[PDB]
Amino acid sequence: PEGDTVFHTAAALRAALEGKTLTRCDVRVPRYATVDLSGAVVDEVLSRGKHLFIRAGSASIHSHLKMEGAWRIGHTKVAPHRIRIVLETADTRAIGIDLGILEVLDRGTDMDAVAYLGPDLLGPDWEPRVAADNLAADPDRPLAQALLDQRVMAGVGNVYCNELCFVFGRLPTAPVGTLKDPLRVVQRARDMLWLNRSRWNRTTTGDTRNGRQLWVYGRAGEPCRRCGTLIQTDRGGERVTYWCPVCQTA
Template identity: 45%
Template sequence: MPEGDTIYRLARRLGVLTGTEVLRSDFRVARHATADLSGARVLGTVPRGKHLLTRLDLAGEALTLHTHLRMDGEWSVVGAGKMLPRRMMGDARLVLETTGATAIALRMPVVELLPTAAEDTVVGHLGPDLLDDHRDVADLVAAATANLEAQPDRPLVAALLDQRVLTGLGNVWVNELAFLRGHLPLTPVGEVQVEPLVKLAARAMRFAVQPGGPGRVTTGNTRPGQRYYVYGRTGEPCRRCGTKLEFSAEIPNDPEVRHTWWCPSCQR
């Protein structure tokens, strides 16, 4: 599933629609099959953790298009008057043709149209987003720290993955953060210095979304296969100490237990 930094960059890409007018909309989901956004002005797209909120003004009515990629969804943006190849359009769940670019939602599992005033019904449960451009970073860190410290007995990686506690972190980030801070993944939150970890998360994620930057990388090495310390490296040697990395698989139907990697020497 795409993580918060990926969604943030995607929102930036969808920013090419901001200020344009919708010429044609084609919803290919049953719930909104008859919806028509023609004439709507695109006000912008805002990321909220792993959610995207595209706000529109349709003849004075404030609407929000809520999308969530989950595992397979994708937004594709093509130039004015262009369209994706026919073989791909079978996966389209929404087409937004504007006076500028055309945006096409492919295999999108969540496509919802709602009043902008009702956005809290889809994202109000989320914890603080460390990439929120509309709040001070120190405030975001403080709020996330407080949420985590309120669950001292919970395993660290489970708490970090809980979008109600802190939104935007996914399996890559939580495994890498646990390694960088030297904590075993199942360490209870109460045994961790939470604020330094959250500050590191904010700094790393904000670095990852810098325009023209290298994207998500924790090792400082952007070569293929070298970006991460532990994530996805089952049985490989630790990049710091050479110890064989360990791995535990996720437990089906248990959101608390995901694929987890760690170094038994560097993390304690």
């Protein structure tokens, strides 16, 4: 999950839970087995970068999504991974599966958990100059590592990292110092995530149709949509990269 998925999940949970009294709060995490927020209203569901917070009563349920489809809404219980939490209201059910962190924090201090985050690409008070100065603060830093650092700005994961590198004509190992305009980079990242904040069908090309949605990610061996050259890929290091060797040069 990247920042768009997490924001969208927060929105889906808001539709299911926000403003409603919890009828069930079953936290299947050992330290939190005794938490039972039933009888409290879910006052707010919000995202902070790749983090989710569910505020109810005096508590804030903090989760960090490692798996797409991590929170599921509806009454179907069959799932590919372990159910870690069930929340219900009179009319709705939300289940959290394969969550990374799932913890119950004090509501009043819940933002201390994530106060170090850089500007949130999908947060209400986004600040592109802060993100741009953070991104450019160390010009010898490799571009992809800087984009993926949640203290620089919050929300880019491997898909958006690959896509941003393509639209700016840079290899992921290019130093940030080679960017003509770091402000433009972070503004385009904001625009890309914003366009997908309510779209699970992640699209960066402007064309949402099947097979048309991304420039390079997941497209090894397919033609670049601009120059026609076949897309290349490398699976060394942490993350898989995809790039057009004509549009993205050293």
